[PDB]
Amino acid sequence: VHLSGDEKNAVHGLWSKVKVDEVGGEALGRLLVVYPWTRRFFESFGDLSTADAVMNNPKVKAHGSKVLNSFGDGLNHLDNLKGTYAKLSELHCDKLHVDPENFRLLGNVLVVVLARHFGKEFTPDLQAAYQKVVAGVANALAHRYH
Amino acid sequence: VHLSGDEKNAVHGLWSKVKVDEVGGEALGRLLVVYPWTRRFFESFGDLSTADAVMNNPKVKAHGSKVLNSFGDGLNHLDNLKGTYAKLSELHCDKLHVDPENFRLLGNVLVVVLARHFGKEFTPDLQAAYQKVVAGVANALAHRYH
Amino acid sequence: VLSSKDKTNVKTAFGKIGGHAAEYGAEALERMFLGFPTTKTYFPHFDLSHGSAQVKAHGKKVGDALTKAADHLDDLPSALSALSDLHAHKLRVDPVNFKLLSHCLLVTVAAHHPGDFTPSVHASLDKFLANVSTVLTSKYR
Amino acid sequence: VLSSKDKTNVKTAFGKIGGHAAEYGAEALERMFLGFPTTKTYFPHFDLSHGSAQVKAHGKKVGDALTKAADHLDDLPSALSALSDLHAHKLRVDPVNFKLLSHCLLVTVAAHHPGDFTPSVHASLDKFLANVSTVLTSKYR
Ligand code: HEM
Ligand code: HEM
Ligand code: HEM
Numbered sequence A, B: 001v002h003l004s005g006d007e008k009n010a011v012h013g014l015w016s017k018v019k020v021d022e023v024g025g026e027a028l029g030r031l032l033v034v035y036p037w038t039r040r041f042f043e044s045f046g047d048l049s050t051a052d053a054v055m056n057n058p059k060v061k062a063h064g065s066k067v068l069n070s071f072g073d074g075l076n077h078l079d080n081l082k083g084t085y086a087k088l089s090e091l092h093c094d095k096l097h098v099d100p101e102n103f104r105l106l107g108n109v110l111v112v113v114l115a116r117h118f119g120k121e122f123t124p125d126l127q128a129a130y131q132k133v134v135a136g137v138a139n140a141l142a143h144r145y146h
Numbered sequence C, D: 001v002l003s004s005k006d007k008t009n010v011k012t013a014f015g016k017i018g019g020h021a022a023e024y025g026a027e028a029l030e031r032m033f034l035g036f037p038t039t040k041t042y043f044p045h046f047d048l049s050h051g052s053a054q055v056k057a058h059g060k061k062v063g064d065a066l067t068k069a070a071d072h073l074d075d076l077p078s079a080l081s082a083l084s085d086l087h088a089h090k091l092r093v094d095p096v097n098f099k100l101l102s103h104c105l106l107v108t109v110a111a112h113h114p115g116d117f118t119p120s121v122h123a124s125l126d127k128f129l130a131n132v133s134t135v136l137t138s139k140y141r
């Protein structure tokens, strides 16, 4: 991804304000609520049939958290997303067979959750830097499909 | 992209047979009639309002030919699509701002044109190998985005 | 929203197919399982090998649905009623996958009808399949 | 068409938005131009900088359209009949771009209504914008 110095400072600065145990679980929960077909990959999580079920689901919360830490990993390695997500690429592509479009959709859900959490601090300029990050994470996880 | 030895042989064997002055022109032409928003990028090509107009347009034919040759370049550098398509990526992404989705659609349009031309010879297996190639070409051309 | 000319090109086209619809269904299914291997995870309960009795029987199901859809152009949602429900609520079929099958259906038609698969018929059939896809994804909306 | 208890969430949300639709329109546009620079090539005639007269005015046209759409949930094809014609036939707007604006609108709503934008509200507004986008793409099929 191509992020300027200002864009790097602004993304890292917003991310240290991110509530680690909250934002990931809200973003996964929201993806599962809004795009009902994504629920097929999370059979073990039990009840995902209502928003109240999804949003009060401890497995959704725990898995969300790990997903948010994986985004953070990418922020630490913006020059080498390919190498960072190489193993997860094989997991999502070769084992689970998640269609790569869903990586973009979840990336955009994270952008929505951040807006929700940060208000006017999540400016048009800052969102535009997270759009670069989120596109890069998606494309790097999709590398196993080319 | 990873094509097996057998797949590489099948793909090159089929490509030696494609009529270079015809198939690229037909593939560009069909994209333009089937997905009318793509005509946005070819406004100097004149009339593209009907199928007859598009399919009897010399500039569409000349440009399809160069597009088919560019796919051919990719066939002989399946190892390095990124480097093969790097400058064209600049052109398509930085200069023309073609949404990367259209690279996928033109790839699949060529695939249906190969089917039209070769009939039974374009088996399920050969198509699958050609799906690998066009997915690789599309992603290499989208590299300036991702 | 299907044009009158598109209604016509679809009518003629499925007048060429008719009873080949089952044979095209199964071929389009194999082309998809091979072209896009992600789509296979939806049928772990079927033998997906070429010419299997399950791919053939399911190919008939899909082909007969498209046959029916072609005869119900102003009526697609009601015509494909049980199917919208099934593919969204029950099967959770990813919206992307309907595009991949629609593509494979076009490849199949082209491969069998090269003389009749004009740029115009190509276009109309793409639009027909786009509307079927829309309907089959509609319970997500 | 949308479900009940979802048809409701749309109409409430636009009231909880109120007449901020014109402001959210222009902000979503700027979020789109900045987040997805490809989308800017459709407005080389407009000044796209923050707070320009032209983005403000066009944002108002987009916000008003959505407002009219919100009280025409049973008849969106007729309500957005002429607009679908414009974006396809005249403007050749790529179908992907509607997803991008729809996303920038959800971001804008979330950024202004942190307490109201619940997972369910989110879900219904997505389906509403999805339905709107489908109608606005209708004339490609
Ligand atoms: C930005 C994109 C994504 C990232 C960074 C990401 C991250 C991760 C990580 C770090 C794991 C391993 C967690 C562990 O070790 O327990 C994982 C597993 C998994 N992922 Fe993703 N994910 C992404 C998108 C998706 C999407 C879109 C889906 C499907 C809709 C999905 C489905 C799954 C499933 C089903 C597992 C294993 C579940 C389990 O073990 O309980 N992921 N992901
Ligand atoms: C399938 C992948 C594609 C390949 C391999 C490809 C290939 C090429 C090549 C080789 C050129 C340079 C031609 C020259 O030197 O004269 C070119 C230019 C161009 N491409 Fe593509 N192309 C692809 C997809 C697309 C798509 C999908 C669009 C738009 C929908 C598009 C729009 C254009 C335009 C407008 C030009 C410049 C034409 C001109 O000179 O007036 N390309 N492309
Ligand atoms: C043109 C698009 C499609 C049409 C017309 C269609 C039609 C049908 C029909 C008629 C059935 C049979 C239901 C019954 O037995 O009563 C069915 C079932 C099914 N469909 Fe599709 N379908 C389409 C696309 C897809 C796609 C894209 C997928 C996923 C990749 C999919 C996955 C399934 C599965 C897993 C079943 C159940 C099979 C079984 O166990 O009997 N379908 N569909």
Ligand code: HEM
Pocket (backbone or CB within 6 Å): D039, D042, D043, D061, D062, D065, D066, D083, D087, D091, D093, D097, D098, D099, D101, D102, D132, D133, D136
């Ligand atoms: C939520 C989806 C959208 C809605 C509700 C919407 C609404 C509108 C409306 C009401 C107009 C009328 C302008 C007039 O009265 O002259 C318009 C025009 C226009 N739209 Fe959209 N639009 C949407 C999506 C898009 C997208 C995705 C693009 C491409 C990025 C786009 C590009 C344009 C352009 C270039 C015009 C003409 C601007 C002018 O010169 O006046 N629209 N739109």
